[PDB]
């Protein structure tokens, strides 16, 4: 099974406090596993999985050592960006970064990521090649020239090709405590009518993992895409996801109306 590891960073300024809010948040495959928040009483990285509780102190502070560094880096960078855009001091800013890696079925790397986004918009980001950057807007070029100079990308690449991989592998190997499991969909149709011509059919799907699912209504085999109420794949609060899809129907036709269901963790598409 393919895997990923993600760090979701976010600094945030609001006025009247010269000291922003920093928050890192880790994720293995689609599941959180660590977390830091500068605005805590004791700002320290924490386990968020059960399998993570299995680390012991040197790890727990090798990371909090880093978080305090990045905290300083974000404070600094947020101010720099202020200048590149001519924003005066006085409002709410946001800087986010996302970094991680991906590995195929065969445990090997497939892709690295390192990308930033200022104010919600892409700012600068690292290429599939790990050697060169893509700057999004003019101001983003300052940083680019600046960073080509200081060889910042090698470091990144190193973290991505090495310490990311080597470390994920071991997350995987303590990881079965949820990671390598595939919770299959649990699908059934609702109803709820009234009105002539109305019946409103509802194909649900529940308890699956990962969130990738495609429910499809069909008349014989021609995909009933018309007024298909599709809901956004939502989380259950447990490690699984939900979803449904409605289609409107002339009451009493329900026979040859049929939503198929699709998922990695299934034997074959669930016809309903």
């Amino acid at each position: 099974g393919p895997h990923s590891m993600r760090y979701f960073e976010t600094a945030v300024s609001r006025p009247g406090l010269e000291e922003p809010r920093y928050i890192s948040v880790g994720y293995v495959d689609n599941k959180e596993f660590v977390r830091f928040d500068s605005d805590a009483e004791n700002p320290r990285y924490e386990p968020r999985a059960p399998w993570m509780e299995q680390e012991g102190p040197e790890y727990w502070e090798r990371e909090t050592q880093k978080a305090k560094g990045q905290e300083q880096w974000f404070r600094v960078s947020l101010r720099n960006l202020l200048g590149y855009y001519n924003q005066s001091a006085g409002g709410s800013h946001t800087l986010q970064q996302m970094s991680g890696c991906d590995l195929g079925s065969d445990w090997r790397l497939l892709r690295g990521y390192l990308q930033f986004a200022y104010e919600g918009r892409d700012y600068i980001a690292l290429n599939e090649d790990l050697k060169t950057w893509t700057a999004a807007d003019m101001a983003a070029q300052i940083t680019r020239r600046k960073w080509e100079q200081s060889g910042a990308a090698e470091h990144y690449k190193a973290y991505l090709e090495g310490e990311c991989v080597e470390w994920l592998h071991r997350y995987l190997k303590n990881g079965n405590a949820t990671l390598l499991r595939t919770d299959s969909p649990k699908a059934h149709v609702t109803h709820h009518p009234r009105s002539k011509g109305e019946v409103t059919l509802r194909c649900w799907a529940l308890g699956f993992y990962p969130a990738d699912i495609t429910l499809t209504w069909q008349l014989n085999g021609e995909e009933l895409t018309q007024d298909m109420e599709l809901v956004e794949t939502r989380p259950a609060g447990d490690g699984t996801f939900q979803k449904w899809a409605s289609v409107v129907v002339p009451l009493g036709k329900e026979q040859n109306y049929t939503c198929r269901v699709y998922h990695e963790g299934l034997p074959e598409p669930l016809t309903l």
Binding site: Y7, R62, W73, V76, S77, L81, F116, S150, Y159, W167
Partner: peptide
């Protein structure tokens, strides 16, 4: 394991 940023923006 976290990454650590070098050069600022």
């Amino acid at each position: 394991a976290s990454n650590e940023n070098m050069e600022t923006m």
